[PDB]
Design a protein around this ligand. Structure first.
Ligand code: HEC
Length: 104
């Protein structure tokens, strides 16, 4: 995935509700730092829905791929308001960008 394109998608579609830096603030959504290989509902300091918490999955490329295409389908009852990125290549670019950013 194109990490630069992925960063722009993040800035346009996710930054309104999320930070990704270590020690970044919760906004509407939880800070995403350390996302990859973490279970749902794990960011310290954030009020998650039970639906998010009870999903049981680990965030990684495959589960983010499916999640971000249609969040309400993946986690019925999630309070994340987002229709989804329907284009596979835009998801791959975004996720390639998140894999770097949330890790650093
Ligand atoms: C506000 C209108 C948001 C937009 C736009 C985006 N996100 Fe979101 N995110 C938001 C909330 C309120 C929540 C918690 C939902 C709940 O049911 O508690 C989330 C959660 C996530 C998660 C789960 C994080 C976890 O620790 O389990 C992920 C992986 C995530 N969000 C990603 C994400 C991406 C990549 C976005 C842009 C495409 C995006 N969100 C937009 C709020 C909002």
């Amino acid at each position: 995935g194109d990490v630069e394109k992925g960063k722009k998608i993040f800035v346009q579609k996710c930054a309104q509700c999320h930070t990704v830096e270590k020690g970044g603030k919760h906004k509407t959504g939880p800070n995403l730092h350390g996302l990859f290989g973490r279970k749902t509902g794990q960011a310290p300091g954030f009020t998650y829905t039970d639906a998010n918490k009870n999903k049981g999955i680990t965030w990684k490329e495959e589960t983010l791929m499916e999640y971000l295409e249609n969040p309400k389908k993946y986690i019925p009852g999630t309070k994340m308001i987002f229709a989804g990125i329907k284009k596979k290549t835009e998801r791959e670019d975004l996720i390639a960008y998140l894999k770097k950013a949330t890790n650093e």
